[PDB]
Design a protein around this ligand. Sequence first.
Ligand SMILES: CCN1C[C@]2(COC(=O)c3ccccc3N3C(=O)C[C@H](C)C3=O)CC[C@H](OC)[C@@]34[C@@H]5C[C@H]6[C@H](OC)[C@@H]5[C@](O)(C[C@@H]6OC)[C@@](O)([C@@H](OC)[C@H]23)[C@@H]14
Ligand SMILES: CCN1C[C@]2(COC(=O)c3ccccc3N3C(=O)C[C@H](C)C3=O)CC[C@H](OC)[C@@]34[C@@H]5C[C@H]6[C@H](OC)[C@@H]5[C@](O)(C[C@@H]6OC)[C@@](O)([C@@H](OC)[C@H]23)[C@@H]14
Ligand SMILES: *[C@@H]1O[C@H](CO)[C@@H](O)[C@H](O)[C@H]1NC(C)=O
Ligand SMILES: *[C@@H]1O[C@H](CO)[C@@H](O)[C@H](O)[C@H]1NC(C)=O
Ligand SMILES: *[C@@H]1O[C@H](CO)[C@@H](O)[C@H](O)[C@H]1NC(C)=O
Ligand SMILES: *[C@@H]1O[C@H](CO)[C@@H](O)[C@H](O)[C@H]1NC(C)=O
Ligand code: NA
Ligand code: NA
Lengths: 210, 210
Amino acid sequence: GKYAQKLFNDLFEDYSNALRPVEDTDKVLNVTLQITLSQIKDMDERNQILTAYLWIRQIWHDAYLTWDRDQYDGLDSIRIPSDLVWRPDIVLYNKADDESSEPVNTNVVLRYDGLITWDAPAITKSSCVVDVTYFPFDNQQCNLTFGSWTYNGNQVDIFNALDSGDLSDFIEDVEWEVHGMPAVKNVISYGCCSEPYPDVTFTLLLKRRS
Amino acid sequence: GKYAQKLFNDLFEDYSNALRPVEDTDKVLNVTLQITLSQIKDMDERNQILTAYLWIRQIWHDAYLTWDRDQYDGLDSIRIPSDLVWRPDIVLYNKADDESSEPVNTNVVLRYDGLITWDAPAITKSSCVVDVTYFPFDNQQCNLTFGSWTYNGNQVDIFNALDSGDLSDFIEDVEWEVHGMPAVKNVISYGCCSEPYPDVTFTLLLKRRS
Ligand SMILES: CCN1C[C@]2(COC(=O)c3ccccc3N3C(=O)C[C@H](C)C3=O)CC[C@H](OC)[C@@]34[C@@H]5C[C@H]6[C@H](OC)[C@@H]5[C@](O)(C[C@@H]6OC)[C@@](O)([C@@H](OC)[C@H]23)[C@@H]14
Ligand SMILES: CCN1C[C@]2(COC(=O)c3ccccc3N3C(=O)C[C@H](C)C3=O)CC[C@H](OC)[C@@]34[C@@H]5C[C@H]6[C@H](OC)[C@@H]5[C@](O)(C[C@@H]6OC)[C@@](O)([C@@H](OC)[C@H]23)[C@@H]14
Ligand SMILES: *[C@@H]1O[C@H](CO)[C@@H](O)[C@H](O)[C@H]1NC(C)=O
Ligand SMILES: *[C@@H]1O[C@H](CO)[C@@H](O)[C@H](O)[C@H]1NC(C)=O
Ligand SMILES: *[C@@H]1O[C@H](CO)[C@@H](O)[C@H](O)[C@H]1NC(C)=O
Ligand SMILES: *[C@@H]1O[C@H](CO)[C@@H](O)[C@H](O)[C@H]1NC(C)=O
Ligand code: NA
Ligand code: NA
């Protein structure tokens, strides 16, 4: 039995990873986003830049990658290279650099109901602002703002999977403690009649250790 | 031929101005907002407060105030005191004072298809920020941010009627010229699962006259 092979061949026989996988163009595709903070690599106070190591988990539905489990011997999920499927082009809007790191290879897990889960590591560089005004009163506020590069909110709509950045895999920094990393979702539209532009923003608040 | 009286009695026989006028409470009510800037009453640079005179036009559909024109001898619109109908409780979120004007009497125009139009004057007081960085390089940025006080975005959703503040009725200020008043719509939601909170913001940019 080569059921996974057969399923793969059946699924991608006529599949384009360039196309937002909705049946209807003016229907939206929803993506949830989870940010896991691995490590504060550097809080540069000279240039006010945070370099962080992150994991990004994106979850969405692909209308064209579903199957009947009964036709494939009960097989209900497969893990494949991520570049085989359409992926949301979510990026850090407020990146401080135009520097491009070489893309690590990643995989997606594809479930029989078209549910796709994608974990990817990332090094981010972004500006922070000193804050000595709000509790705990000796801080660096480091916003991380994420969204689609090319799709508006009626094409790809983005949601926070969690109330905050995920700190459960975090390794402590000797100089900075993480006070909080609350997540919000912003949507802006211009004038009467523009398309909506959503983001999710994590406000990483760092407290200077004493 | 007292058709307007007959219509009024028929419309308001069993009507409550306390209830958001949707047939299904889980459905949204859409409101469009137009701001007309009448006058800059005071640009207080000591306290960084703008006092402005505005007209606010709100338009929305009332599901319970529709009628068949052909049943009322073709009557298709009536003008009545505004406190007779449910009204959106849109307010200036970023008001600077406790501390409001005594409310004046206003009217709404009610169209046969349930479309209600409501003009009301307002005196607003709000903080501004000095800006000498961006063109035209000697400015006051005065944001005016409006939204419902008690309803979230799934209950009452607000939209800009125009691309900008309406300046067609504006009387010039001797000290300040209006450089622009672009309008945007912002929506924020907190964490994974909160309701959405929309506003419309007018960024009134004032240029100092030399
Ligand atoms: C295709 C690249 N794309 C990147 C953009 C980038 O958007 C952002 O950076 C951004 C989005 C929401 C909130 C804040 C944002 N932001 C930041 O956080 C930093 C940066 C200054 C900024 O604008 C994504 C959304 C939209 O594309 C769907 C853009 C807008 C759509 C439209 C707008 O034209 C003015 C605008 C674009 O300029 C080009 C487009 O022209 C067809 C775009 O490049 C981005 O503008 C910043 C903006 C477009
Ligand atoms: C009922 C009064 N209402 C006024 C508020 C006030 O909202 C704002 O001032 C506001 C809204 C959007 C964007 C920016 C806003 N804002 C500010 O919050 C400060 C600044 C002046 C400003 O512009 C409207 C939205 C929501 O109510 C539907 C509120 C929130 C809903 C919820 C939130 O608490 C968890 C929050 C409230 O505190 C109370 C509520 O608890 C039942 C509320 O009073 C306002 O918070 C500022 C906020 C609520
Ligand atoms: C996208 O998410 C919103 C909010 O949960 C939901 O109402 C809508 O039906 C979703 N649309 C699709 C196509 O999944
Ligand atoms: C950081 O992001 C939060 C959430 O969007 C926002 O309220 C705050 O103003 C941002 N901080 C700065 C300095 O822009
Ligand atoms: C509210 O407005 C949007 C257009 O922006 C529309 O799609 C939606 O159907 C409207 N809802 C109601 C109840 O009018
Ligand atoms: C004024 O409002 C605009 C539009 O929402 C916003 O981008 C800008 O940051 C605001 N300015 C200040 C000083 O809050
Ligand atoms: Na959110
Ligand atoms: Na708008």
